[PDB]
Amino acid sequence: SVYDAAAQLTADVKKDLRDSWKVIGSDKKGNGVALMTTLFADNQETIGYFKRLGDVSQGMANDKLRGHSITLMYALQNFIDQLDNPDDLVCVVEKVAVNHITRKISAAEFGKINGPIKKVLASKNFGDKYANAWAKLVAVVQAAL
Amino acid sequence: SVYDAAAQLTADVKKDLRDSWKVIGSDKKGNGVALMTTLFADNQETIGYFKRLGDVSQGMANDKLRGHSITLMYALQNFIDQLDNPDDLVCVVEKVAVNHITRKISAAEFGKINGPIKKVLASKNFGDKYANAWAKLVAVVQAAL
Numbered sequence: 030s031v032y033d034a035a036a037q038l039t040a041d042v043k044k045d046l047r048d049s050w051k052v053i054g055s056d057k058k059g060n061g062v063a064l065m066t067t068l069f070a071d072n073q074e075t076i077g078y079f080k081r082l083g084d085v086s087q088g089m090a091n092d093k094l095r096g097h098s099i100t101l102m103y104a105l106q107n108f109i110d111q112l113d114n115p116d117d118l119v120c121v122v123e124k125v126a127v128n129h130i131t132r133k134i135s136a137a138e139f140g141k142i143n144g145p146i147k148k149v150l151a152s153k154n155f156g157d158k159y160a161n162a163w164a165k166l167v168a169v170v171q172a173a174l
Numbered sequence: 175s176v177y178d179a180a181a182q183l184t185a186d187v188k189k190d191l192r193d194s195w196k197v198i199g200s201d202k203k204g205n206g207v208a209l210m211t212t213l214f215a216d217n218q219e220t221i222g223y224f225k226r227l228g229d230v231s232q233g234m235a236n237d238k239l240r241g242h243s244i245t246l247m248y249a250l251q252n253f254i255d256q257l258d259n260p261d262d263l264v265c266v267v268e269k270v271a272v273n274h275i276t277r278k279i280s281a282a283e284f285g286k287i288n289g290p291i292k293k294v295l296a297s298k299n300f301g302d303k304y305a306n307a308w309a310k311l312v313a314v315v316q317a318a319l
């Protein structure tokens with residue numbers, strides 16, 4: 030269950046999540062857009078899903094993409110803040126899950142975000158240990174998809 | 175015009191928004207649910223729009239309502255954090271606007287949130303001065319609906 034996946038996040042994992050978020054979460058506009066642009070660059074097959082955003086190749090100049098990217102970073106902020114209470118983490122995770130289920134996004138497709146996250150983390154010198162921690166958090170959402 | 179509305183956020187208004195947010199934003203779960211339950215209580219005609227959340231009268235005990243409420247508070251956190259740059263504030267406001275336009279929510283009905291905000295602020299000892307400040311921020315979203 031989603032609860033099982035959340036309850037499985039250890040103190041060490043939460044520590045790495047919080048430490049890395051202190052940095053990548055400090056520039057939501059910059060890192061948020063970087064995350065989306067990396068997703069489109071390495072997984073071009075996902076571009077079609079974001080037609081509402083218009084031409085995503087415009088990057089920062091695209092107001093719809095910028096608004097989307099910043100908002101996505103607050104969803105992650107939400108997750109990070111609820112880490113110590115699995116009950117609260119689960120209900121916010123399920124909220125995000127529903128928004129993607131309605132778009133026909135499978136658990137496997139949702140996991141495509143791990144690549145971009147790893148690269149963005151690496152840009153700030155956060156290695157594999159941190160990428161693995163984030164994959165565990167993403168896995169919590171996948172449990173609901 | 176969302177841009178003209180955003181221009182109404184003067185130095186004094188922004189200060190009042192930040193000062194009051196430091197208090198109400200400290201407990202997103204509690205105040206988030208308080209806002210929603212107040213909305214449903216004072217404006218029963220809006221409950222129909224929230225069919226997905228199930229029995230909203232259950233308040234905090236309703237997992238979907240709690241998840242929804244916390245997420246809403248992060249939308250406000252988003253707005254507050256973008257007060258420095260009007261171009262960024264506008265793109266995140268339009269993002270939220272789209273989510274309501276699709277649910278057929280008009281500017282007039284969106285404005286029904288002012289009552290709840292006024293009451294929640296009042297319970298924390300923040301009077302009309304602050305309620306009016308928030309009314310102006312809500313007005314920015316209304317301009318995009």
Ligand code: HEM
Nearest residue numbers: 075078079081100101104105128132134138139141142273
């Ligand atoms: C870190 C993981 C992710 C998070 C936290 C996340 C978060 C979000 C949020 C908050 C929204 C806005 C929901 C709304 O207002 O309707 C959104 C929309 C969306 N997401 Fe994700 N997402 C993630 C990964 C993905 C991935 C990997 C895909 C695709 C393979 C995806 C596809 C979509 C689509 C299609 C939309 C709708 C965009 C639109 O039309 O406005 N998401 N996501």
Ligand code: HEM
Nearest residue numbers: 128220223224226245246249250273277279283284286287
């Ligand atoms: C401070 C004002 C408000 C803010 C910042 C706000 C923010 C949000 C956010 C972020 C969501 C989640 C979007 C999603 O993931 O689909 C949402 C959903 C929604 N909002 Fe609002 N909202 C506000 C006022 C209102 C009002 C006054 C109404 C109606 C009278 C309304 C009706 C809805 C509905 C119907 C949903 C969909 C709920 C669901 O089915 O899950 N909102 N709102």
